[PDB]
Ligand code: HEM
Ligand code: HEM
């Protein structure tokens with residue numbers, strides 16, 4: 001459950017991603033695939049090489065979904081219902097993998113937004129990503 | 142995130158619990174303290190012996206809180222705000238312990254209400270207790 | 283895993299009443315229903331689309347019997363679980379890459395099934411002994427991760 | 429932990445630039461802020477009521493130095509983490525009863541702090557090498573649980 005301060009922090013911090021959405025999302029995916037190679041099992045037919053255009057394109061989708069989540073942060077299950085159906089019902093992604101990607105998103109944000117990534121904002125972003133992860137790993141239709 | 146059917150399953154199952162709510166809460170606590178002795182560190186001044194009137198009294202409080210949560214399953218953060226502050230802000234309970242108590246509650250229900258504890262009801266109750274646990278381990282003031 | 287003589291006796295007495303043809307399938311089936319991502323590991327088992335489909339699936343039942351057999355073997359080798367489960371650990375960790383939290387989940391679903399079947403006999407001290415056992419088994423299965 | 433010579437070189441080179449006096453406190457502080465239940469283990473440390481109070485707390489900074497030193501000790505002998513951390517494992521597991529998930533959390537908070545400090549230099553391959561290190565350290569700290 002996010003506090004009002006959490007929502008404020010997330011909107012402010014994620015708001016700085018902007019046109020770098022694809023780049024940051026792709027970097028987070030690349031970090032995950034490299035650091036935690038078991039995650040690649042979910043993408044059996046992807047080109048997961050360094051600099052892959054396919055990973056770049058997928059990074060944009062992830063980042064844009066996070067933008068969507070921020071714009072609906074008080075009502076996320078209804079806003080992300082399609083993504084929950086994909087990840088929980090169709091793909092059956094083990095919940096541990098969401099912790100891995102969430103960590104890699106935090107690392108990416110820490111590496112690119114040093115001024116923004118204060119301890120308080122770090123805490124809020126972690127809670128936000130945990131909340132998104134819970135929605136995407138739940139079946140609630 | 143609970144499905145509409147999950148909410149119905151939880152309400153039906155907890156309703157069957159009825160007047161034994163308190164007894165089952167005490168048993169779940171007793172199971173937790175015995176099976177997972179580290180949990181006793183949160184109750185250092187408690188009489189934790191078998192048959193403890195203090196544990197019985199506390200079991201009733203826990204059960205009544207769950208009954209309230211079932212009544213407000215659509216609005217649990219608001220309904221449990223005081224309890225969240227107690228467990229997350231004051232007591233600082235490690236979230237692993239909520240998984241332990243949740244399991245001991247399911248075991249208690251399974252032992253006492255075997256006909257009711259179908260696979261679908263088991264699934265819904267596990268999700269419900271996870272949702273309660275998330276609220277009680279969150280600081281969202 | 284060390285059990286007191288009282289705990290060993292109680293664990294053995296309860297296990298003797300377990301239906302070895304059914305309980306493993308009940309445990310495995312409930313795992314697949316309660317934690318649905320675990321179904322990804324069993325795509326070849328056929329219909330898992332509803333709780334009734336899962337619980338009545340012949341391949342879930344048959345596989346469940348193998349799982350129960352592993353728990354039964356463990357009960358006779360509690361002082362050497364890491365050795366006993368070495369082949370299974372290599373399979374589940376190195377080949378299948380099952381996240382080890384799922385081993386803990388299956389153990390606790392088994393405990394719920396024992397509670398369901400044996401009610402008042404599954405007292406809190408009996409449960410505590412079984413938690414030691416399933417924690418030992420989960421830890422031994424996860425050994426390749428440690 | 430098995431690092432390639434290239435990975436060990438990358439990790440060692442970066443760690444040579446890590447501020448011994450500050451980075452451990454930053455990581456411990458962020459653990460306390462991001463995962464507030466961990467504050468329960470540090471009652472005697474004084475004021476942890478706000479993120480600023482935590483990050484400015486002298487005892488957090490001082491303790492953080494010790495934590496960093498232990499990671500440094502791990503780096504110095506990657507082939508014997510279990511031996512290096514045996515005493516610390518007894519302390520954290522048998523005495524303090526820290527749930528071992530928290531060991532993973534602190535390791536990952538350290539990785540975030542490294543990324544924060546080094547920016548572009550903390551490349552995905554450098555991170556991957558550090559993730560092996562912090563997983564090894566967490567496993568070694570948790571050894572008494574296994
Ligand atoms: C914050 C967490 C996540 C977000 C916001 C997210 C978002 C998305 C989005 C927007 C898509 C594309 C949906 C579409 O094409 O309609 C997608 C697809 C996918 N996601 Fe994620 N995802 C997350 C976590 C994960 C994780 C942790 C995994 C596995 C390690 C995963 C595995 C996949 C796969 C396999 C696909 C489909 C790829 C394909 O075959 O086209 N997702 N996700
Ligand atoms: C479903 C999960 C839980 C529920 C519904 C619940 C509910 C409650 C309630 C109603 C109270 C009494 C508050 C009051 O009247 O002032 C309480 C107190 C307390 N709870 Fe929980 N609780 C849960 C989980 C846990 C867990 C997992 C732990 C630790 C292992 C824990 C530790 C405590 C402690 C230490 C107290 C205060 C006891 C005292 O010193 O008086 N709770 N809880």
Ligand code: HEM
Nearest residue numbers: 320323324348349352353378380384385386388389420423
């Ligand atoms: C925690 C206690 C567990 C025990 C005692 C156990 C035991 C076993 C046994 C005896 C086998 C047969 C090995 C063989 O035929 O050589 C097996 C296979 C397998 N296990 Fe488990 N297991 C456990 C947990 C899990 C979990 C949580 C999963 C998650 C999905 C899993 C996934 C599998 C799969 C996919 C197979 C192979 C099935 C096939 O033949 O297609 N296991 N396990």
Ligand code: HEM
Nearest residue numbers: 466469470494495498499524526530531532534535566569
């Ligand atoms: C995961 C990597 C960790 C490392 C490398 C580490 C390292 C250390 C070291 C070097 C000490 C001092 C030992 C001594 O003075 O003899 C210590 C003490 C301590 N650690 Fe950690 N630690 C870790 C994780 C944790 C976590 C996650 C917690 C709690 C959530 C924790 C709680 C404590 C406490 C309470 C003390 C004693 C503080 C006091 O003196 O009052 N540790 N640790």
